[PDB]
Design a protein around this ligand. Structure first.
Ligand SMILES: Cc1cc2nc3c(=O)[nH]c(=O)nc-3n(C[C@H](O)[C@H](O)[C@H](O)COP(=O)(O)OP(=O)(O)OC[C@H]3O[C@@H](n4cnc5c(N)ncnc54)[C@H](O)[C@@H]3O)c2cc1C
Ligand SMILES: Cc1cc2nc3c(=O)[nH]c(=O)nc-3n(C[C@H](O)[C@H](O)[C@H](O)COP(=O)(O)OP(=O)(O)OC[C@H]3O[C@@H](n4cnc5c(N)ncnc54)[C@H](O)[C@@H]3O)c2cc1C
Lengths: 588, 588
């Protein structure tokens, strides 16, 4: 075990120092490297249980069993006197810069995963380049550094969600004694967009500054992997060049899909366009039933939009379907219209977007319900949210030897390795992984640490918590009820559940018995919590802490023993008692 | 172990059935009892690991080793044929009603603990009485069933806190694109109070209905324990009577303290009066620095009040003092004035409350700072929040033999037993216990289950999470940093920390580097999380889930492995890295 680990660590690390905490010579080297501004990984052997065995194994690489020992790109470069010799002769900078390739790491993609990986690698002295390019949407929308989440995803989505929530805070205010004339209050889409875009702008800038401060080379360039170590780059002027890298991280993410219908690409928009849209969507049709579809429909309705969601089959496929129905029901009860069992056939333009008064155009949507009745209705904006897709034909040459699955995603090992051994893939393009920002970030940081700092820790992709930021939010961690039943059998599953009502909703005169939570548990495994689900306000804040407990293997008894904080929504998880099998009502 | 448990269970249970899940005769008895509307505890022996040993030990009580076996108040009453005999002869109701005392349980106090205990006991066939009386405040304020939390505590406090938070939602709305004229918006205290009081009214009613539905006798009467089994009751007409009970639960809670200064009782108010106050407090002085003091000062300021807090020494004594300072700093930065190192000497009336126009009076507060400078300032309302005290001289005769500590609180065993063996104490009057609503409720339910259903489970009073609902909320679970250092030594404590900024605050233009979180960890115990602390919005929702993980013995590694939900405030706990010892800035 130790021999394998040390071999991999020496082979892969860009600059690494083997040391001990109580070592005066190790400190001398550390001080020299710090003065010379040489970043590096450090392994303190006296902080590892196999540290003595590691010390002895180092002689297979250096011929010595003492500390300190410094390595650069797979080669022992010296002990304490040797490093200080390089230093006094002005040879040290040259030695630590010596490389077969232009970079130790090239990251293709400057999004959630790629930026996380690139910054983390640079910390340990890996010579790093991050490439980012944003291919314009069909209408021409583009954006700056940071990826999907920062520019056209989690960040602007949640900010618009908040603008939506404030709509209802305005109503609630009156019941709590605030005197205001709601009939004279309106929302300005464009003002909201400007505020959101200003914040996104500060993030674009912040990431650029961060890369500079970490000595990462940032290239606003389209990258193409043409061989295992060669990346072809195309800049803004269309000038083509080649750079070389030892390790390659593919982190190019996905883009929205369009349905294959006449008028879709020409007249429809996606989430890519929505978050910087210069005009008010107005009367909107959202085609799709993904978490993106419902989130966007939701905030658009709360901002006073006339909103219809066209649903082919079900909502939130892959999510707990009881919870998905509850999410949909709340939206429907609050004005979101659902065109159920309906598919679109054709989109026709009736009016072009007014680019001077910033007003939407007008569209005619033609379709049909499964019952054969025709759908024909005018909408000012049509948004497609029918899923997202990798675009690796734009990123990798087929002769490189990176294997993709049927969906065009990269087939990876549990340490993100592709079929090309120096090439790794993280984030949304990694086949089978939850497609979320903190997952991409964790994967990128953990990978960079394994590659360049001798870490062993893999990213745990199991029981990753999620939150859907619909008008009433839905948080989950672990298995849906249906998945747990399929896996373990109905007889081995117990479900504890309850409705609840936020205290805030009482004076506000909001719904009884709408907010809902459940714990899906395994009877034969000490009532192990397999899945946690909550529909309610601040569901992400509620859910997060429980994800740690679930990771640790929480049982129903652990929940029972723990005391609630009052008054909160979350405390309801501490006193659950009604089982589904008992048939008792979950109402309170 | 088994013999001791069975002896206690038989001795204490009011009505109990020993049974097995696959037992046709046990079902016959169950059906008979259900038809006769006889509530009872049930112990299923085939669901206990020592069930076979229990079956054999039952013969020491009944002379038989078979199931079913039914017991009433310490006596075996029969097997299956015997119970059905009583049933067919119309003797069963008489047998299960036969008792030495009027009640199996008398609960003195109809608050958080008492109602929880009384309702839970009734479920297992304990003949139960709940006594509640609300002694008026010096100005005459009184309220209905439910206790401190329901009427003059957590419920109205959090509702007023929400009215306060809505103040700032109104400001935020503008930055998110909402068009409104804030210069024309004002708050009406009385309208808010009416809304809050209507909700409290529904809770008063709900609890009364709940007791009726559970067949609990509710007496709106002042109770006095005059001997171990005798409770003297005084009704509204001042008629005095005596009732007897087997088990007694003392759950009488606490009332606000007044400082011993001229004018305090005559002209000041407390939290007891504040939540139904018919007039606007106006320019207010809050005397005290408890969580109650700061919470009330906080919402009063957000509702446009001119608010001063008079602080003798420190804020939130007993809470983490770094966090307490941060809580105070936020309040001070947002308009709450603090009269530091200042004590009050005298309160003089300048104007009487206008009882027709519902306007406050006016007061003159005279005091002095520790530097000798005089304090002399006019306030419309003076609120004391200088702590709370038990009042058991109003509840128990000294000859009963219940031991109290120096503070007047009841000295209890770890199963809530007093020095009088049939007498128990729960909630705020139980010496040394965290004084919180869910603690009282857990204690009451768990006690009732041990007394009447053979449960063994004790209430766990360790690592009980809390939340202070100040303008910026403070959630905690476990040890303060100072307490952990005192207990384990500075060398054994590592503190991970970070500032954060809610995404919601970006567009709203609120503070950077004000929200804050830390994990206080023990180095020698695998970096065990000893204390969790968060200053930020929805801090109770953030904190709760982590309390389960902490209960289970979470380490820093468990936090690290767990993936964040984005975008949330809580996710910041999943990626903490800056230690206090490193001296690196926690800023982001
Ligand atoms: C509307 C929406 C809302 C979402 N909300 C949430 C949420 O609330 N919480 C959450 O956790 N997740 C959310 N997500 C998902 C989250 O955005 C993604 O999981 C995350 O951004 C994936 O990061 P990544 O590194 O894999 O790819 P990305 O962030 O997409 O970054 C890839 C980058 O590489 C660039 N690129 C592509 N090809 C090349 C090339 N050839 N050369 C150079 N650069 C290239 C891309 O243009 C892009 O900039 C949301 C997604 C969407 C669409
Ligand atoms: C302003 C304030 C805010 C608070 N906020 C929170 C919070 O946010 N979260 C939280 O967890 N806790 C909070 N608390 C604490 C919480 O209110 C108490 O911990 C809880 O109410 C204690 O319940 P209890 O059963 O011990 O007593 P109580 O709820 O006080 O009930 C005791 C009842 O018995 C009655 N009684 C007294 N003597 C007799 C007698 N002789 N005969 C008959 N009846 C009698 C009393 O009048 C009272 O009705 C707050 C407290 C205050 C004061």
């Amino acid at each position: 075990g130790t021999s394998q680990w040390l071999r991999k660590t020496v082979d892969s690390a860009a600059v690494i120092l083997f040391s001990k905490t109580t070592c005066p010579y190790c400190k001398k080297v550390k001080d020299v490297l710090a003065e010379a501004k040489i970043k590096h990984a450090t392994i303190e052997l006296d902080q590892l249980s196999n540290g003595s065995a590691i010390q002895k194994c180092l002689a297979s690489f250096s011929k010595i069993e003492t500390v300190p020992q410094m390595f650069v790109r797979g080669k022992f470069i010296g002990d304490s006197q040797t490093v200080l010799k390089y230093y006094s002769n002005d040879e040290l900078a040259g030695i630590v810069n010596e490389s077969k390739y232009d970079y130790d790491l090239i990251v293709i993609g400057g999004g959630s995963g790629g930026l996380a990986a690139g910054k983390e690698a640079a910390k340990y002295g890996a010579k790093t380049a991050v490439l980012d390019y944003v291919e314009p949407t069909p209408i021409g929308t583009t954006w700056g550094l940071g990826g999907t989440c920062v520019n056209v995803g989690c960040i602007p989505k949640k900010l618009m969600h908040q603008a939506g929530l404030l709509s209802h805070a305005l109503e609630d205010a009156e019941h709590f004694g605030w005197s205001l004339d709601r009939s004279k209050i309106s929302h300005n889409w464009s003002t909201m967009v400007e505020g959101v875009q200003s914040h996104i702008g500060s993030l674009n800038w912040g990431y650029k500054v961060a890369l500079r401060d970490n000595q990462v080379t940032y290239l606003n360039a389209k990258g193409r992997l043409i061989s295992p170590h060669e990346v072809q780059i195309t800049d803004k002027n269309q000038k083509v060049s080649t750079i070389t890298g030892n390790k390659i991280i593919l982190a190019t993410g996905e883009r929205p899909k369009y349905p294959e219908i006449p008028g879709a690409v020409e007249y429809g928009i996606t989430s890519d366009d929505l978050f910087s849209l210069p005009y008010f969507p107005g009367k909107t049709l959202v085609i799709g039933a993904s978490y993106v579809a419902l989130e966007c429909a939701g905030f658009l309705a709360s901002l006073g939009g006339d909103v219809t969601v066209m649903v082919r089959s079900i909502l939130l496929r892959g999510f707990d379907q009881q919870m998905a129905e509850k999410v949909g029901d709340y939206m429907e009860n609050h004005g979101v219209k659902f065109a159920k069992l309906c598919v679109p056939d054709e989109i026709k333009q009736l009016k072009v977007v007014d680019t001077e008064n910033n007003k939407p155009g007008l569209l005619l949507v033609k379709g049909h319900y499964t019952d054969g009745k025709k759908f024909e209705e005018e909408f000012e904006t049509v948004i497609f949210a029918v899923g997202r897709e990798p675009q690796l034909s734009k990123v990798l040459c087929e002769t490189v030897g990176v294997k993709l699955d049927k969906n065009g995603r990269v087939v990876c090992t549990d340490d993100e390795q592709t079929t090309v051994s120096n090439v790794y893939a993280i984030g949304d393009i990694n086949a089978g992984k939850p497609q979320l920002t903190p997952v991409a970030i964790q994967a990128g940081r953990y990978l960079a640490r394994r590659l360049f700092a001798g870490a062993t820790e893999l990213t745990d992709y199991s029981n990753v918590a999620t939150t859907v930021f619909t008008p009433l939010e839905y948080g989950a961690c672990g298995l849906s009820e249906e998945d747990a039943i399929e896996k373990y059998g109905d007889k081995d599953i117990e479900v504890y559940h309850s409705n609840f009502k936020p205290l805030e909703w009482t004076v506000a005169h909001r719904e009884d018995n709408v907010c809902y939570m459940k714990l899906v548990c395994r009877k034969s495994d000490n009532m192990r919590v397999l899945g946690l689900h909550v529909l309610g306000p601040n569901a992400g804040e509620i859910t997060q802490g429980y994800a740690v407990a679930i990771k640790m293997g929480a049982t129903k008894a652990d929940f029972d023993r723990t005391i609630g904080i009052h008054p909160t929504c979350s405390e309801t998880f501490t006193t659950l008692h009604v089982t589904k099998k008992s048939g008792v009502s979950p109402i309170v």
